[PDB]
Amino acid sequence: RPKLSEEQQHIIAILLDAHHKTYDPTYADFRDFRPPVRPLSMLPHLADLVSYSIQKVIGFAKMIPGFRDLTSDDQIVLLKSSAIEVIMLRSNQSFTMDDMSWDCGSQDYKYDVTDVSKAGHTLELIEPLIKFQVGLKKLNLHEEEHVLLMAICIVSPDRPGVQDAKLVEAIQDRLSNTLQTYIRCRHPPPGSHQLYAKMIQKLADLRSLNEEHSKQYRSLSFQPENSMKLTPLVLEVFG
């Protein structure tokens, strides 16, 4: 009999709140960003959107149970490698399958494939990105599952640069066991059908998206003209 322990429920409650503290479904701060233009017209706005979102991802990470027991070097490598992944993941909350667009409250803040290519991406990234968003949206995760997946994503032991892989593995294990156990006790059939394995597969899709993302970033980078238009958090994190 798999039972959701007190500790597992506490874990879930923390990550929910950590998400509520770091994802503003008003999208109010978006007026602060350089404005969108619709020749790489979107790059300044989307650089800013991503920069902001790295900050939120860092705030969420810090609240992951056991994350503050890592060395600050391990914390750093885990965010550098996961950031873009966690952003694609969290963005699922604003993605809508009507338009296959990310809809953040108004026409200005509604982002479709033309906008993404207007930041220098080809169908190399965009096509598997949209398929990823679609497949994730079709899982209909409970919010509990969404937040566990983000956290499992951040605390991955195999990330390049990881020093104490054993500790990272032990923290992620407690999160995966919490997720596996939650699906069992709380996700009804038939939605729950191989839901864990489907979730893990999304993490593999995100690794492949990460790789492609690195390529396109490294390419965009080698022109200082473009790199100039980014933020310093983005340069630090993706450089």
Binding site: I58, I76, E236
Partner: peptide, 11 residues
Amino acid sequence: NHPMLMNLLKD
């Protein structure tokens, strides 16, 4: 060499 990230991470 990640002062911004390291600053956002500190307590």
